[PDB]
Design a protein around this ligand. Structure first.
Ligand code: NA
Ligand code: NA
Lengths: 208, 208
């Protein structure tokens, strides 16, 4: 019966828990959960001691943490293998130059301005995408250029910008260690991901 | 039946939820919660739409947040009234001196050393207690003095220390606004709490 607000709130909480458990692969008996919830609220004597229940839950958390780590390590290794393959094929393509760090670049149009330094501030327009073509960032949304210091950006950009004459448009292929590396809290960027960026340097300005 | 690890984990999760809900005063029907959890995991059609359930839960969170704020404001006002009463009675007691900020103090033993300044570093031994006598902090545990800068301590201490000759032992009565004020994330110190401290200044040292 979902006639009362109490029933509807109770059903809605259960449904949210169920979705979460099913998404995480946690197998649970809803009837046994209801028994424990009822006995705890009624003030009855629980069929398990407080230590027995503390032992079951501490083990569950450890088992869950292990499975999560194993799935993150699996994805990181898959992304690394895909990246090494893409960059191994990209180096054989026309215009591709490979640098000692593993950063690769292709010149779309060369500019005639100055190449920025590490302390310098640069204004740029760019689009960042994964090897599948999924775009994750662009100034084309803002409709406005972006300003950054060459030393405060991802390593791949710091290396490329110091070789780019102002006015130039280049495409860069960044290994994961020159990007976000073995980390993926969220976003469309997962662990050990190789990235592709189209970057246009508009202007460079000194500090002092 | 709690024969399997699945049943025992399920019962243990339910018991923890029940305790939490009972401690917060949340009234829930365990059977209706089990129905929603089962239907969500089975992939069935839920008796409520996703918007209906999103409306029930958003209202619940607002109702809960309101009740929590109302109980925190109630405790803060009670603690303020108790504090004003204690300090109104303490000012009539022997040796009690009342300062313009509302800080009160009583000299147990006067020292012959120098009175510290705001930039100075001071070494002290102390015990802090509530008006009920509950001790919340002491150097008597560490078995060692504590070192602090006069400007980085609670306002009540900053005011008293600048009047205390080194070697002195004083008892101080601090209004809540010269202490932690309207805040209580945890600890034994709740909101708008007046505090009592026995403080012995051992030594004072300058900065430059
Ligand atoms: Na391309
Ligand atoms: Na006393």
């Amino acid at each position: 019966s979902l006639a009362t607000d109490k029933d509807k709130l109770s059903f809605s909480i259960g449904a949210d828990l169920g979705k979460n458990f099913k998404n995480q692969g946690i197998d649970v008996n809803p009837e046994a959960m209801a028994k424990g919830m009822q006995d705890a609220m009624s003030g009855a004597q629980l069929a398990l001691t407080e230590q027995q229940m503390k032992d079951v839950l501490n083990k569950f958390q450890k088992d869950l943490m292990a499975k999560r780590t194993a799935e993150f390590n699996k994805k990181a290794d898959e992304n690394k293998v895909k990246g090494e393959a893409f960059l191994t094929e990209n180096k054989n393509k026309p215009g591709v130059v490979v640098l000692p760090s593993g950063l690769q670049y292709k010149v779309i149009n060369s500019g005639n301005g100055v190449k920025p330094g590490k302390s310098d501030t640069v204004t740029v327009e760019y689009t960042g995408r994964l090897i599948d073509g999924t775009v994750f960032d662009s100034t084309e949304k803002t409709g406005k250029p972006a300003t950054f210091q060459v030393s405060q950006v991802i390593p791949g950009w710091t290396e490329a910008l110091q070789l780019m004459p102002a006015g130039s448009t280049w495409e860069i292929y960044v290994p994961s260690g020159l990007a976000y590396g073995p980390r993926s809290v969220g976003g469309p960027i997962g662990p050990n991901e190789t990235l592709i960026f189209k970057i246009h340097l508009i202007s460079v300005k000194k500090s002092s």
